[PDB]
Design a binder for this molecule. Structure first.
Ligand SMILES: *[C@H]1O[C@H](CO)[C@@H](O[C@@H]2O[C@H](CO)[C@@H](O)[C@H](O)[C@H]2O)[C@H](O)[C@H]1F
Length: 300
């Protein structure tokens, strides 16, 4: 239903629109690292998220380091399973080259180009696919102008050679928070979005003003990772501030993916320890975070 109705996505005047030009907002879940919690990413769990939660996008978080793709590349196959499931369920899917401790996207750029060549050659003629080429650039020595933009200008051409206009989400500086710098020095590709990430444990009023600054420069923004917890993914659940961000994203028509779908014992995890990896969760199998996220997407 979703992908058949909205079809080809694109960016028009800094907004995400469907193939008939109407604004569309995607809301879904991100996996946790596929090298650790890959059992939660399968057709059945994704189908349960779609039908019971109302998700319209799923994000496959393929860590590169921390036991991820560079150490064991077999995890790319789990990305393919998520993509195929999304195609079968007629929802959108984000392929995330999940950099983090490998804080500069240039560290593994050659592997990233090869990876994105393969993914775009395989799925480049489906409208479901959204490429996220560098999850969270971070560090004082990793800037938009010197490291991130140039990386993006190497990897985007590889993708575009196989897939001319599916959406590409590009990470920003300071753990994908520095949308200001990226919005003042935008990429040429017309179907790019800049990532913006937030954690409800952080007081967010200036961060909201910064997203508004970026939007005002005509940059499109995709909230490809956010949590109800602190920045570490644990440390409490902050639903009042999470609700303020939810409302802000609805007012600005910003698409988002919540972190994360796992049973790990950390506040941002959506599931409790005994949740079935294939779905069908009862209220008791959802954590306080997962209960809130599900309500937000159902309400949508
Ligand atoms: C965005 O922020 C989330 C929360 O910090 C990160 O997810 C955390 O990553 C650490 C390091 O891998 C894991 O130990 C935590 O369990 C996990 O919640 C995510 O990687 C980042 F993109």
């Amino acid at each position: 239903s979703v992908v058949e109705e909205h079809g080809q996505l694109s960016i028009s005047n800094g907004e995400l629109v469907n193939e008939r030009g109407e604004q569309v907002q995607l809301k879904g879940m991100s996996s946790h690292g596929l090298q650790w919690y890959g059992q939660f990413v399968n057709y059945e769990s994704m189908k349960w998220l779609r039908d019971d939660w109302g998700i319209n996008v799923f994000r496959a978080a393929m860590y590169t380091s921390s036991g991820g793709y560079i150490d064991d590349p077999s995890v790319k196959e789990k990305v393919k399973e998520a993509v195929e499931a999304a195609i079968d369920l007629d929802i959108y899917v984000i392929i995330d080259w999940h950099i983090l401790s490998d804080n500069d996207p240039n560290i593994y750029k050659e592997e990233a180009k090869d990876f994105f060549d393969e993914m775009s050659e395989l799925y480049g003629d489906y409208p479901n696919v959204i490429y996220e080429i560098a999850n969270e650039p971070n560090g004082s020595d990793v800037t938009w102008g010197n490291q991130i933009k140039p990386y993006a200008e190497e990897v985007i051409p590889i993708i575009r050679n196989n897939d001319p206009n599916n959406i590409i989400i590009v990470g920003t500086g300071t753990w994908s928070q520095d949308v200001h710098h990226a919005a003042d020095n935008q990429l040429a590709d017309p179907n790019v979005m800049y990532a913006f990430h937030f954690y409800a444990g952080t007081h967010g009023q200036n961060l909201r003003d910064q997203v508004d600054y970026a939007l005002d420069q005509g940059a499109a923004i995709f909230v490809s990772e956010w949590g109800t917890s602190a920045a570490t993914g644990d440390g409490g659940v902050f639903l009042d501030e999470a609700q303020v961000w939810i409302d802000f994203m609805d007012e600005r028509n910003l698409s988002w993916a919540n972190w994360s779908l796992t049973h790990k014992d950390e506040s941002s995890a959506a599931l409790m320890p005994g949740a079935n990896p294939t779905g069908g969760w009862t209220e008791a199998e959802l954590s306080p975070s997962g209960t809130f996220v599900r309500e937000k997407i159902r309400e949508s």
